[PDB]
Amino acid sequence: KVQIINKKLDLSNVQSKGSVQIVYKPVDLSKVTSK
Amino acid sequence: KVQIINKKLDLSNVQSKGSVQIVYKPVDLSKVTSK
Amino acid sequence: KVQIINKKLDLSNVQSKGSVQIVYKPVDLSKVTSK
């Protein structure tokens, strides 16, 4: 009945009174089947 | 009946009184089937 | 009956009293079938 894929990429700074966060070549596959 | 793919990319700064966050070549595939 | 793809790209600054956030070549494929 119900088939769900959820993919989230979170990127956040909280700078209060530089900053580097890199994602370098991500590859994502999601395989969900039924028989 | 119901087949859902959800993909979200979140990018956020909170600067209160530079900033770098890079995503570098993402590749996303979502494969959900039924038989 | 129901077949849904949802893709969202979020890009946001909150600057209160520079900023760089880059996405560099994203490739997205969404494959959902039925038999």
Author numbering:
A (entry chain B), B (entry chain A), C (entry chain C): 274 to 290, 304 to 321
Mind quoting what the paper says about this structure?
The ordered assembly of tau protein into amyloid filaments defines a number of neurodegenerative diseases, also known as tauopathies; they are the most common proteinopathies of the human nervous system. The physiological function of tau is to promote the assembly, and possibly stability, of microtubules. Here, we used cryo-EM to determine the structures of heparin-induced filaments assembled from recombinant full-length 4R tau (2N4R, 441 amino acid isoform) and the corresponding 3R isoform (2N3R, 410 amino acid isoform) to resolutions sufficient for de novo atomic modelling. Our results show that heparin-induced 2N4R filaments consist of a mixture of at least four different conformations, whereas heparin-induced 2N3R filaments mainly adopt a single conformation.
The extent of the ordered core, comprising residues 274–321, is almost identical to that of twister filament. Again, the structure is characterised by an overall kink, which, with an angle of 52° between β2 and β3, is the least pronounced of the three 4R tau filament structures. However, unlike in the snake and twister filaments, there is no inner corner of the kink. Instead, one long, slightly bent β-strand extends from residues 274–290. The K280 side-chain points towards the inside of the core and makes a salt bridge with D314, whereas the K281 side-chain points outwards, and forms a salt bridge with D283. The strand residues on the N-terminal side of K280 have also their orientations reversed, and form a new cross-β interface with the β3 strand of R3. The density of the whole arc was not good enough for model building, resulting in the omission of residues 291–303 from the atomic model, and ambiguity in how the strands on opposite sides of the core connected to each other.
